[PDB]
Amino acid sequence: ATKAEYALTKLKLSNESVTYCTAQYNLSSMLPQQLLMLKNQTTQVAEQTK
Amino acid sequence: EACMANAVQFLTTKDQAYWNAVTAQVAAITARANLGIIKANFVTAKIQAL
Known part of the structure; x- marks a missing residue:
């Protein structure tokens, strides 16, 4: 049982590694793109106000 | 008296x-x-170290 649990902990490193890469991709690509989306929406609100 | 004294000691x-x-x-x-x-x-101790 301890040996089986050791393998589970050892294999768990893969999920943590891909999670870090997934989070890194979101910060580098998704977040800046969403900022551009919000800016365009902000301008549209002013035009609708006009 | 010697036999009687040893008899009590041995029997007890x-x-x-x-x-x-x-x-x-x-x-x-x-x-x-x-x-x-x-x-x-x-063997369990060796596994636990890993």
Whole structure:
């Protein structure tokens, strides 16, 4: 049982590694793109106000 | 008087010595059984380090 649990902990490193890469991709690509989306929406609100 | 004095001493301790030996024999068998558990725990300690 301890040996089986050791393998589970050892294999768990893969999920943590891909999670870090997934989070890194979101910060580098998704977040800046969403900022551009919000800016365009902000301008549209002013035009609708006009 | 010498025979009478030794008779009381021998009779009182006649059975005590026998049962002390019996207890030691049982403990030796039990200790041998526990020896196998120690070997199993030795592998467990190695696994736990990993």
